[PDB]
Structure formats: C-alpha cells, structure tokens
Amino acid sequence: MWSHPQFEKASTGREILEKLERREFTREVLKEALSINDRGFNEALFKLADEIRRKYVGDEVHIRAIIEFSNVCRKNCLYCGLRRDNKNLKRYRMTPEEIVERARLAVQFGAKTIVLQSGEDPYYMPDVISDIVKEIKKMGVAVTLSLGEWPREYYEKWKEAGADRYLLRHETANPVLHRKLRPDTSFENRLNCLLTLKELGYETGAGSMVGLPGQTIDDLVDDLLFLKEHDFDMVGIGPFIPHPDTPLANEKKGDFTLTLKMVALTRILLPDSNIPATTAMGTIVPGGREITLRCGANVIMPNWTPSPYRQLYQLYPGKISVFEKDTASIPSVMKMIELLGRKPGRDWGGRKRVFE
Ligand SMILES: C[S@@+](CC[C@H](N)C(=O)[O-])C[C@H]1O[C@@H](n2cnc3c(N)ncnc32)[C@H](O)[C@@H]1O
Ligand code: SF4
Ligand SMILES: [C-]#N
Numbered sequence: 001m002w003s004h005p006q007f008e009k010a011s012t013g014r015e016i017l018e019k020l021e022r023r024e025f026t027r028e029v030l031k032e033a034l035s036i037n038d039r040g041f042n043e044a045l046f047k048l049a050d051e052i053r054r055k056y057v058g059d060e061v062h063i064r065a066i067i068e069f070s071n072v073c074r075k076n077c078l079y080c081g082l083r084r085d086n087k088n089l090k091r092y093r094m095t096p097e098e099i100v101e102r103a104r105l106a107v108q109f110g111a112k113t114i115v116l117q118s119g120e121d122p123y124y125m126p127d128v129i130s131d132i133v134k135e136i137k138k139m140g141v142a143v144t145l146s147l148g149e150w151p152r153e154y155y156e157k158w159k160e161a162g163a164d165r166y167l168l169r170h171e172t173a174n175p176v177l178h179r180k181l182r183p184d185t186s187f188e189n190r191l192n193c194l195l196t197l198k199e200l201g202y203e204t205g206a207g208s209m210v211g212l213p214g215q216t217i218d219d220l221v222d223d224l225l226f227l228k229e230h231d232f233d234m235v236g237i238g239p240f241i242p243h244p245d246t247p248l249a250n251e252k253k254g255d256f257t258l259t260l261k262m263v264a265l266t267r268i269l270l271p272d273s274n275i276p277a278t279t280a281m282g283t284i285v286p287g288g289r290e291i292t293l294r295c296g297a298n299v300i301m302p303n304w305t306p307s308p309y310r311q312l313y314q315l316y317p318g319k320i321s322v323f324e325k326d327t328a329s330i331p332s333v334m335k336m337i338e339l340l341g342r343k344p345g346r347d348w349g350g351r352k353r354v355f356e
C-alpha cells in the first residue's frame with residue numbers, strides 16, 4: 001500500500017474553473033466549487049457568472065414591484081414567520097381596491113412587472129385573484145403571482161385572467177428534508193405544481209433557500225441539478241434566516257458567501273434565466289443585493305407593500321425597514337441600478353432564449 005496525498009488547492013480551483021468554463025457540470029465539479037473556501041477562487045467564480053450574465057441577459061436590471069397583500073397562511077412551514085402556528089403576529093388582508101390602486105402607483109413609478117405574493121390565504125382563491133389580475137393587466141405591465149400550491153384549475157383560471165409568470169420556489173430538492181420542514185405537503189406536490197405551471201405556459205420560477213437545518217453541500221448540488229434539469233425561467237435563491245417565533249429560531253443562519261456561490265453557479269448553469277438579488281440577500285449583508293447583482297443576478301424586487309401592512313409580512317427578522325416612507329423602494333432601486341452602472345429594464349424583461 002502507498003500514500004494518497006491531496007492536490008494543491010489553487011490548481012484544483014483553476015481546474016474547477018476550467019471545467020465550469022467548458023460547461024462540464026458533473027456533480028463532483030459542482031460539489032468542489034461549493035466546497036472550496038478560497039477568496040480568490042470565489043472571486044473568479046463570481047467574475048465568470050458576471051461575464052455570462054453580461055453576455056446572455058445584458059445590462060438591464062428588471063424591477064419587479066412586490067405587493068405582499070395578505071399574510072394569512074393555511075400552511076405551517078417550520079422556517080416561515082407566517083406559519084399558521086405563529087400566534088405572535090398580527091394578520092392582515094388587503095382589499096382588491098387597495099391592491100389594484102397600490103399596483104397602479106407602482107406602475108406610475110415605473111415598475112414594469114407587479115408581483116402579487118401572499119400566504120396561502122383561501123379567502124382570495126381563485127376568483128378574487130382573477131379579478132385583481134385582470135385589472136392590473138389593463139395597466140400595460142407583466143403580472144407575476146406567488147401564491148403557493150393550488151389546484152390546476154386555479155392556475156388555469158389565473159393564466160386565462162392574464163397572469164404572465166408564477167414564482168414557486170422549490171425550497172429544497174431533498175424530499176426527506178422538504179417534508180420535515182413543510183409538514184403540510186411534499187416535494188412531489190411542489191414539483192407537480194411547477195410542472196403544471198410550465199405546461200400552462202407561465203414563465204415559471206423555482207429556487208431554494210441556502211443553509212436550512214439539515215441541508216448539506218450535497219443537497220445544494222442537488223438543487224443546482226434540479227434547476228438545470230427543468231430550465232426554469234426564473235430562479236430565486238436566498239439564505240435561510242431563522243425567525244424567533246418558529247421551531248427553527250435557534251438554528252444557524254444561512255451563509256452569505258455560499259448563497260452568492262449558488263447564485264453564481266445558477267447563472268453559469270442557466271445563462272439566460274432571470275435571477276433576482278433577493279430581499280434576504282439584502283437583509284443578511286448591507287449592500288447584499290448590490291453584491292449579488294455583480295455575481296450573476298439581473299432582477300431586483302423592491303417591496304411595495306404599503307403601511308401599515310408592510311411590517312407584518314414578517315417572513316424572517318430584518319426583512320422590512322420602516323425608516324422610510326412606503327413609496328421609497330422603487331426610486332431607491334433605480335438609484336442603486338444607476339450607481340452600479342446598469343440600466344433599468346426597457347420592456348417587461350421576460351425570459352428569452354438566446355443561449356444555445
Ligand atoms: C413566504 S412565501 C409566500 C408565497 C407562497 N406562500 C410560497 O410559500 O410559495 C415566499 C418565500 O419566502 C421564503 N422564506 C420563508 N421563510 C424564510 C426564512 N425564514 N428565511 C428566508 N426565506 C424565507 C421562502 O423561500 C418562500 O418561498
Ligand atoms: S413559506 Fe409560504 S406556504 Fe409556508 S408558511 Fe410561509 S407563507 Fe405559508
Ligand atoms: C425576492 N426578491
């Protein structure tokens with residue numbers, strides 16, 4: 001028997017970068033990319049993702065204004081502050097008039113997509129959502145829905161009402177972990193919803209949280225390969241941020257650098273996808289969304305939920321700032337985009353197929 005020494009770190013890093021540039025996306029390559037802890041490797045990975053972003057989605061940063069119109073949820077996800085078992089949260093619902101008029105104001109401030117997000121609140125489903133969608137589509141913008149898991153019939157009604165896109169983050173592709181953290185449902189249900197949304201012609205968004213309890217690097221590789229397999233139009237990635245009024249209050253927070261590497265690898269794997277710099281990335285690090293837009297992201301989603309509701313959509317601590325008026329976020333992100341040397345989107349920023 002003979003010895004078994006390891007290879008030098010920088011050359012292994014350079015070899016991983018060459019494999020990524022050559023698009024040899026094996027599980028071992030992705031695992032090693034996520035596992036290397038070297039600032040110089042990471043910076044090269046971010047620059048590769050940024051280069052691919054520049055070439056295949058260009059310099060426009062698309063603004064999607066989010067209205068979080070109800071924090072009522074019938075589910076009990078262990079990570080989420082809106083879970084039904086959290087009795088320490090005041091619940092709200094916006095009326096259709098409030099939602100439509102608030103969307104009109106975002107359109108006037110220049111948002112070209114309105115995102116309607118909520119807890120899984122049966123009050124609205126399906127007909128109130130359809131009415132709201134029809135009204136917002138008259139404003140000349142794209143509509144994205146992010147309402148959770150519903151019957152095919154509801155997704156079909158909302159497509160006929162004019163919805164363009166649907167964001168349903170897959171959360172974790174590990175089906176054992178998925179059921180432990182989302183005890184009302186399953187990864188199989190979540191995937192069935194995603195496949196139904198794609199079949200109905202929505203631009204379909206998935207994406208995962210990084211740093212969930214029980215999740216390993218191998219699980220993150222499985223997330224990347226799941227996203228690649230389905231060629232999603234949008235991918236939303238952010239760190240897990242523990243919420244004090246949930247069972248996961250004392251678990252580790254997700255790591256910002258690892259999450260950034262997930263964004264970068266997602267851009268490399270899916271060069272023409274729409275990838276936001278998520279709210280959670282700006283919560284965990286000051287300037288986190290700006291950094292993420294330099295590592296492969298090309299979308300930003302300013303929070304347009306009005307007072308007095310915005311502070312109650314408490315998915316995780318730190319999500320909401322109340323230091324400025326509730327109309328500040330769209331001008332703020334426009335200023336951010338300008339300071340980055342980028343441009344706001346000129347059209348609706350729908351996903352295109354330009355990578356072959
Ligand atoms: C709150 S839900 C609302 C829409 C719909 N109920 C759903 O679950 O798809 C939107 C996203 O918030 C994110 N989220 C929830 N709790 C979080 C936490 N503690 N840390 C980071 N993200 C969280 C999840 O990824 C979830 O997909
Ligand atoms: S993640 Fe979505 S479905 Fe789960 S508790 Fe939170 S709002 Fe409800
Ligand atoms: C979400 N941004």
Ligand SMILES: [Cl-]
Nearest residue numbers: 064113144165
């Ligand atoms: Cl969108």
